[PDB]
Amino acid sequence: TVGPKQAITSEASTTYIPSRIYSESLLFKRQEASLSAMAFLFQEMISQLHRTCKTAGDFETKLSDYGHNIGIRLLELLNFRASSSNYITKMRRRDLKILDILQFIHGTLWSYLFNHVSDDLVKSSERDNEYMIVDNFPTLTQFIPGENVSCEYFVCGIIKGFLFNAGFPCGVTAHRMPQGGHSQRTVYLIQFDRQVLDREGLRF
Template sequence: MIGVGKIKQYSNVLDKPLSKGKQEVSSSAFAFLFSELVQYNQTQVDNIAELERRLEDAGYAVGARVLELLCHRDKGNRRETRLLGILSFVHSTVWKVLFGKVADSLEKGTEHEDEYMISEKELLVNRFISIPKDMGTFNCGAFVAGIVRGVLDGAGFPAVVTAHFVPMEGQHRPRTTILIKFGEEVLRREARLEHGNFNDLVKAIIATLVDVKYTISLHPNSFDLGQDELS
């Protein structure tokens, strides 16, 4: 007779294993929950900018936790240290965990070196949202922008992250673009990492030349070639 195994009970959610398991959630359930989040915050503010800021703050907390989970479960507590690495991590790994797919596109800004854009034709938080005319350009994508900022900030890549609607030719609904503008310290660190080995080589060459010049100044005759040596 085959006995039926007992399912282990956990008294605390933090005691549960961090295995991937089944991650799918009903889109209607999420839409209802997110709608409640938006409506609650709407009662706490006086303008659209403040509402988007509150949604971004809520997303930031989610992003920080997503980073901790993924780094512990998938990377053995290792984190990305390069700019393109963390962007790829957000564009693919984080997006898959949150939305079940990689983002539609990841692009670098053409006007500014510190800007990158992640775009979605139908971002989940905007898919079932109907924005009243009196709310103007209100974008629920601010919640996702907060998630991205939480991930980047936790990984050591501070940035200003905002959500924008971008009209698409032939499409009724605009796409959502998450604009990432990294801090100057991130770009300086990336430049040091990118050119670190080259800079070390240059410094070594300069140090060698300085030593040679100093030696020549002390013993100029030792570096003169006589006529016999030239013939």
């Protein structure tokens, strides 16, 4: 009973020290787990959502909401641990262009989620506000037959959840472009809206 939605309390500074209850180190210890356990939890996720949903579209939106609830957490944790706690630090750039948060994703997010850095990151020549984020080998979903793409939305559900909470609202879809020796390649394309673009249209 400290902060309700009803009032504000007034208590004096430089009073007595209160009790010590719960604390934890924010910086990561290096922890590893098998790929099989997270793959088993991932297929159990897709199995339960296959069980309790009717058609493909709202299944995809529910999986994207599942990814969203990791991404909105993950933004502040990765930026705070890339700024460096009780140790003396400061504050990163807190980047605000479009072309460097995607650089931040392709550099740090994919090398945080996985051992390897993300592969390629190109724009679209035919239209602006379309950005291609591509890998060669999806390590979330390498265990499903390749003709289904909807099970690939969870990771781009992260990316929308990484982007909308960072101040750039957008929308993502994913397709599979079988280019080269990689049969599954998994393009994720990011559709922004107009209302952000003219904002950076206003900023020269």
